[PDB]
Tab-separated table of C-alpha atoms in Angstrom:
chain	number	residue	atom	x	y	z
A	7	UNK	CA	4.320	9.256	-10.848
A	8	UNK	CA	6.425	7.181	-8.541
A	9	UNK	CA	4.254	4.224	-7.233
A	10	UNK	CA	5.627	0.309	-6.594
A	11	UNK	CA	4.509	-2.152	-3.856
A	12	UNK	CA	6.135	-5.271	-2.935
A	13	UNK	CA	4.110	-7.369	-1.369
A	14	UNK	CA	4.015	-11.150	-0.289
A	15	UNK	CA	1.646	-12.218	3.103
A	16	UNK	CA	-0.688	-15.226	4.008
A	17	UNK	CA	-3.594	-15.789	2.051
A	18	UNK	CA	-6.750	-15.436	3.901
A	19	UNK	CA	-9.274	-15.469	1.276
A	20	UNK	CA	-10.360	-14.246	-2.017
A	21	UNK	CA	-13.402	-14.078	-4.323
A	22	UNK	CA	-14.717	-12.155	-7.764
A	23	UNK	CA	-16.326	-9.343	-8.207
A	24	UNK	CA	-19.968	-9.125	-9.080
A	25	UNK	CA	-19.199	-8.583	-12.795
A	26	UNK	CA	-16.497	-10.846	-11.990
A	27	UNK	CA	-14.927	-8.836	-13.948
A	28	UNK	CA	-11.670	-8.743	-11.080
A	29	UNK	CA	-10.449	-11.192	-8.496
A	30	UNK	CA	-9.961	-9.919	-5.288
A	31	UNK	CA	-7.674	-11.665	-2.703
A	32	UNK	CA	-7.147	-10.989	1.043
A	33	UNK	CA	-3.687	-11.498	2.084
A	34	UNK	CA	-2.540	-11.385	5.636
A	35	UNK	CA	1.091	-10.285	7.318
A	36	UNK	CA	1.607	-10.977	11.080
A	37	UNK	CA	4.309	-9.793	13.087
A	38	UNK	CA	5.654	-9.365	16.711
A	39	UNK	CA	6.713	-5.328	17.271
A	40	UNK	CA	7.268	-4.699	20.749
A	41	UNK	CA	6.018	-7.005	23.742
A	42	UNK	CA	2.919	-7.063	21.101
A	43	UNK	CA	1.676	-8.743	17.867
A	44	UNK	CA	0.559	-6.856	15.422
A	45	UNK	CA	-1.490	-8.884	12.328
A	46	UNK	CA	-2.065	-6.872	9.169
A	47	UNK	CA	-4.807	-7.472	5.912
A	48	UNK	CA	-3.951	-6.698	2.789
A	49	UNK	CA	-6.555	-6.778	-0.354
A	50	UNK	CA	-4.472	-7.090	-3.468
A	51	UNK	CA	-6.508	-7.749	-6.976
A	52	UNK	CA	-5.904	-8.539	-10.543
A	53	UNK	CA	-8.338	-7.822	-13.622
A	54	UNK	CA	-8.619	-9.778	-17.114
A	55	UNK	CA	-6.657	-12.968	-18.149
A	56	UNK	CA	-4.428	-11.713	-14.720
A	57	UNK	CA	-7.684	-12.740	-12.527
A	58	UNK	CA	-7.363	-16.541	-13.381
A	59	UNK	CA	-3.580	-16.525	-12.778
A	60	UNK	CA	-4.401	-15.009	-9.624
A	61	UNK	CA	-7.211	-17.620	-8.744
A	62	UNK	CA	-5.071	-20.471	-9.909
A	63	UNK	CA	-2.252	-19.489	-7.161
A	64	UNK	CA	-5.110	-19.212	-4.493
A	65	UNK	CA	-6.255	-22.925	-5.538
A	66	UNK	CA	-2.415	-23.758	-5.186
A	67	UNK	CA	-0.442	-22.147	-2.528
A	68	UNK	CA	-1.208	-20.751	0.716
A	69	UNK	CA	0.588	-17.854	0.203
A	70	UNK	CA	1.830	-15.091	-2.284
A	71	UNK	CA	4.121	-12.865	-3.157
A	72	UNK	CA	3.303	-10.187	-6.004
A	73	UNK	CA	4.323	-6.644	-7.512
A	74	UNK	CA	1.656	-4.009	-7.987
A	75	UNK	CA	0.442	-0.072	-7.379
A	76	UNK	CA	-1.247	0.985	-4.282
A	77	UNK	CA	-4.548	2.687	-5.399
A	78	UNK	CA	-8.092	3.426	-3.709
A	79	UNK	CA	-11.642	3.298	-4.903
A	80	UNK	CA	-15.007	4.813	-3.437
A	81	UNK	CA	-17.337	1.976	-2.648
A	82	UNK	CA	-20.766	3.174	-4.021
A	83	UNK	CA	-23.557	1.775	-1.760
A	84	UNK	CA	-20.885	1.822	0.881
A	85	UNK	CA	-19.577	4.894	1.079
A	86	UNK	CA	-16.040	4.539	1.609
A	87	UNK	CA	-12.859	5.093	-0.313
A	88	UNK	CA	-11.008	1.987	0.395
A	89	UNK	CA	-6.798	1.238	-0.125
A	90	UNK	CA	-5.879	-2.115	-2.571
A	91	UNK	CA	-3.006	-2.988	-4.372
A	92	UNK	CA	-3.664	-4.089	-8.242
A	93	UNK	CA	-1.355	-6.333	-9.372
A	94	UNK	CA	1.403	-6.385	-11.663
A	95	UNK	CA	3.536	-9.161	-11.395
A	96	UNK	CA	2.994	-12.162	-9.225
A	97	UNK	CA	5.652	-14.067	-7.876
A	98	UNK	CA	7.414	-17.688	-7.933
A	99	UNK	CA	7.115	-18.643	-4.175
A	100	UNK	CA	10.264	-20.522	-4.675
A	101	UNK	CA	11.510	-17.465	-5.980
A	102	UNK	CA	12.870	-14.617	-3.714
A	103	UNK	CA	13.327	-10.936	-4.873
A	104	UNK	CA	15.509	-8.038	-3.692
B	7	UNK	CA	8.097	-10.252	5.082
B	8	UNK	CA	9.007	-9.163	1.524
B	9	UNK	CA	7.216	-5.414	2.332
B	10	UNK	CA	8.394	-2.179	0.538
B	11	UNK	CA	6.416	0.817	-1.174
B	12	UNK	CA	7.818	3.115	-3.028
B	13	UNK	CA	5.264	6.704	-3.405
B	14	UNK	CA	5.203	10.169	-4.319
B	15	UNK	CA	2.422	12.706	-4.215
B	16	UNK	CA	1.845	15.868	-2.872
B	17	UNK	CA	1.362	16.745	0.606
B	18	UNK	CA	-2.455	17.882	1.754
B	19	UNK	CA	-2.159	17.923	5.692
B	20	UNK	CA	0.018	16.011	8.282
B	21	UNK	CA	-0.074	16.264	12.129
B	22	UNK	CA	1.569	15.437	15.224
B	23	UNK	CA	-0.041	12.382	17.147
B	24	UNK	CA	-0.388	13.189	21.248
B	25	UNK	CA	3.072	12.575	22.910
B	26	UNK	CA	4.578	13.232	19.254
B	27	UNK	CA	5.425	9.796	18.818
B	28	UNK	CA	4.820	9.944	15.277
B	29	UNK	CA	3.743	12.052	12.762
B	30	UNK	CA	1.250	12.036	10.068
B	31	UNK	CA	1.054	13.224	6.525
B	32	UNK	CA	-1.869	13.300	4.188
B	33	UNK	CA	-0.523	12.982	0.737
B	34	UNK	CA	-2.710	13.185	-2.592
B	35	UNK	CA	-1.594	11.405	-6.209
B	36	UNK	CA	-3.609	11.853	-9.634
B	37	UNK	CA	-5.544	8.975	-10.699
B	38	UNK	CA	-7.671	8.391	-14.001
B	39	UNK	CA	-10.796	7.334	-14.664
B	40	UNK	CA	-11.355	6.981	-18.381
B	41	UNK	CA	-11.163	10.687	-19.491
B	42	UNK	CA	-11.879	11.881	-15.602
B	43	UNK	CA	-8.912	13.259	-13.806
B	44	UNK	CA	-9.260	11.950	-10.065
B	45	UNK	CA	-7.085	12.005	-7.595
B	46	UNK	CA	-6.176	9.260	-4.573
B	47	UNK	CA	-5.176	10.206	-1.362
B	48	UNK	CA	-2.758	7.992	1.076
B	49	UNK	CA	-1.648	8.301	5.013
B	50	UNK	CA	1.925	7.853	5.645
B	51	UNK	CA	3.801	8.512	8.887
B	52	UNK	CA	6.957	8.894	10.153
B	53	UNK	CA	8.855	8.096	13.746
B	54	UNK	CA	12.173	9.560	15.714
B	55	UNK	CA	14.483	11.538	14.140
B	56	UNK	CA	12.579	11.208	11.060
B	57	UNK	CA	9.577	12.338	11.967
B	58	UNK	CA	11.019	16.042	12.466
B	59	UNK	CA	12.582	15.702	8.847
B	60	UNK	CA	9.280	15.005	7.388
B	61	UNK	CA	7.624	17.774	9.327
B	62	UNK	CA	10.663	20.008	7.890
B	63	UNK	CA	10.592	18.411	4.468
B	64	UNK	CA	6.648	19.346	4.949
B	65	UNK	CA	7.621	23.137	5.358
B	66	UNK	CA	9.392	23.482	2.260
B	67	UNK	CA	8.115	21.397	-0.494
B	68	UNK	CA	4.642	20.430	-1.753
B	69	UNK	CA	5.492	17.271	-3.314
B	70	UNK	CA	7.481	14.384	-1.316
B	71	UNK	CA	8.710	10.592	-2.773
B	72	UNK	CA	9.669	8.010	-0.364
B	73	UNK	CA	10.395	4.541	0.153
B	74	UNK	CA	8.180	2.558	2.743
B	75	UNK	CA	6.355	-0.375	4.407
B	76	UNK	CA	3.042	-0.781	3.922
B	77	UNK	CA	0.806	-1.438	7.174
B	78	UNK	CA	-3.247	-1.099	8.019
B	79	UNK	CA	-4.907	-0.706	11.181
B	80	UNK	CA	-8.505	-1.694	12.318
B	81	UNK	CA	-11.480	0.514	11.501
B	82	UNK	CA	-13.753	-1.373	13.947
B	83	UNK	CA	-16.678	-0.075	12.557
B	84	UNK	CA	-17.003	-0.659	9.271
B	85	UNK	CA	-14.551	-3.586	10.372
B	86	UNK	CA	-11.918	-2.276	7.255
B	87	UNK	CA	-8.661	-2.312	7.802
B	88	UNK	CA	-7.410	0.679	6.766
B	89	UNK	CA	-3.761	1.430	4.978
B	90	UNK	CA	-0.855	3.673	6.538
B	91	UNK	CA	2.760	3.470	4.887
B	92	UNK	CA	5.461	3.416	7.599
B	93	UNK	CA	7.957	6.052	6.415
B	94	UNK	CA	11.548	4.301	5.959
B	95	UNK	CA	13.076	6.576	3.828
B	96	UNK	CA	12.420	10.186	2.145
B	97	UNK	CA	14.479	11.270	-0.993
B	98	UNK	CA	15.525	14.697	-2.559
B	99	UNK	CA	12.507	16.236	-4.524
B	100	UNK	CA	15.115	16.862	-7.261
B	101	UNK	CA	15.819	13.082	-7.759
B	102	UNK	CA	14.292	10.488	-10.249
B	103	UNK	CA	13.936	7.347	-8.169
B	104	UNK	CA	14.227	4.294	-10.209
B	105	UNK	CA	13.169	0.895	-9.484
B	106	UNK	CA	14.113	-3.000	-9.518
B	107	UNK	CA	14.493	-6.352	-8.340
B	108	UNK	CA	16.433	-9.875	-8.856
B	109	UNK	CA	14.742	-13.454	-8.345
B	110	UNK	CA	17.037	-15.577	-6.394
């Protein structure tokens, strides 16, 4: 069904996965709400030739702006079903959207 | 910062937080797994005004699509941040969204 994320933030840090098989980068958004700041983390990933274009952006700018689905995934020998976005389109940072 | 999230799934359980300044559904979408049918389950919440249509919207229908902003709090333990979508807009279960974007 109906599922598109648009999402752009601070990269933070990023590495492979132990098949390497997907790189998986931690993007962060930081924002004042109230009287308060309020920082958010974001893990965003990309699998096949999509991994290296991904890596390539995190050895180039310090922040990115991509297109994706939001999706979650049970850790095995963790336990936990945790939230990502996988990636669809990543962006020109000189580029804005709308 | 460029943040918006378009969903749809169907609702599983939602609740009121303590002074009712929000409230919170539990929605569920299908997922695959090679032949497996799965499912995935996301938090999304809702404040003012709109926080009464979604508990309204959540007495008639099953099923609910919106258009939102994607946020995470702090699990301290596990130290994950879990994922919430901030509720910005709810649409007519008998419309087919549709989306795109430029690149000024």
């Amino acid at each position: 069904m109906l599922n598109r994320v648009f999402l752009e933030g601070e990269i933070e840090s990023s590495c492979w996965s132990v098949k390497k098989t997907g790189f998986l980068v931690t993007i962060k958004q930081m924002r004042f709400f109230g009287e308060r700041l309020f920082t958010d983390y974001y893990v965003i990933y990309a699998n096949g030739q999509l991994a290296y274009e991904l890596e390539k952006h995190t050895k180039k700018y310090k922040t990115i702006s991509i297109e994706g689905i939001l999706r979650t995934y049970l850790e095995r020998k963790s336990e936990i079903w945790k939230t990502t976005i996988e990636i669809v389109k990543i962006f020109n940072p000189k580029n804005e959207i709308v």
